Amino acid sequence: ISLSDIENLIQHIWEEPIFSDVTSKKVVVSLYGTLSKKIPDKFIIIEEVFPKDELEDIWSNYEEYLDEYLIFPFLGTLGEAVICIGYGNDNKGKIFYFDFDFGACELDGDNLEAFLEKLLESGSTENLYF
Amino acid sequence: ISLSDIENLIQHIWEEPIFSDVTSKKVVVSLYGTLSKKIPDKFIIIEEVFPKDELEDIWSNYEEYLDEYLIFPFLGTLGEAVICIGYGNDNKGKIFYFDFDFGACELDGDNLEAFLEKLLESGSTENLYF
Amino acid sequence: KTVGGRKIINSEFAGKTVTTKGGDVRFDSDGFPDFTPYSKKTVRVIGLTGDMANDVPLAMARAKITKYDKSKYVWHHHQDGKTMMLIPKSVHSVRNGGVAHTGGRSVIQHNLLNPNNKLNYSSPEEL
Amino acid sequence: KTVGGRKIINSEFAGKTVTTKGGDVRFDSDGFPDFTPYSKKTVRVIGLTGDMANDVPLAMARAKITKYDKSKYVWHHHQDGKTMMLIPKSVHSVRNGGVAHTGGRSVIQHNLLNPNNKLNYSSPEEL
Structure with a gap:
């Protein structure tokens, strides 16, 4: 794997304000049809931006689980x-959900910008519909 | 509406053994992607085959709710x-789920035979997977 | 008068009384029918999801019964999302001359999508 | 050793002990880690769904706490589908040197699909 290439894919996540903002936001699972059929969660609460200076150690722990999907956790x-x-040719830059209970799921072809734009504040009272 | 035409669509449901069998069977909701996103139920338990001699009265009660979907409850x-x-030109013979909480949902283009073939016994212990 | 962005069915009768084959049914100010005059079992259940086949066994256990007459009764989800009620089909079910309506299955699912602005409806007394 | 038709993660260590950054973790005969030596709160909850954001508040209420150190701990769903456990990330989380594993979120969902043949795992004592 090219960690430099990984950094180029995700570098905007370390910029402010989004670096500090994103860990109070959440993914609206119902916007993603396949994901909504795969997991029970209605929202995914974002808790940590993985720091650049830890990606090598994090990948050393995740590589055996994720290298066949060609997705990198951030x-x-x-x-x-x-x-x-x-980070593969088919899925480069596309955002995925992964867990060890249900597996991997592409977020409908959204790239990083599209994924970030659709996040809600965790405390949002925005009315959501079926 | 042509109740004679409706009878021609559903007449096999009144034949034995399926007439008596079907009310111990259930729909596997996860076989139907759109339905699985629309309702929380994992299985739909079938309870009654609407009898031919009651369809007119049943439709007199349901018509105001279902005539715009062009689907007929059985x-x-x-x-x-x-x-x-x-019973419309677009959906003729296709099976639908309907309720007053979540609405109508086509069962992926299955006709009556395809719908019946995929039902499970309600007491089935068949191993089902994600 | 919506749940999950869908119009509450027959909500235009909110605060009014409608006739059914099994008797008059009053609709409350939010557009939900009041089936308390007809319920044979009104039971609080923790963990309702709106999945009928999952929720009915929980209601039956709290009701202390193992069978009911399915030709006569149907289980209703109260809009509180916490109570199940055993209601005659003659008032509850369109097919049997009852009144079409929206119930707690919708509210439970609405609240999962609106966790910071839930619809919190009061509960009937248990029976 | 499957749940929902998926291989239980690291089930090849069933009955064995694995090392993590936070200490040794024993995997039981079914392939599930035993996090009881590490849990700071082990609480029974009715109505777990596997939805983290829905289930954590229920566990927190039963644990009688309103906050926890999210840099240090993570809530674990026990395979009983009835218990939540507050576990150090150093044993629970791959990102922090913990051990990858399958948990009760999968079992809860498996049981919804297999209502006549549920996986019924015993519960740890509350803490």
């Missing part, structure tokens, strides 16, 4: 699920 | 949901 969540980014 | 379930059959 956000931690309230549980063990991780938000990942594709 | 199975009752454990709750208020009904299994319906399409």
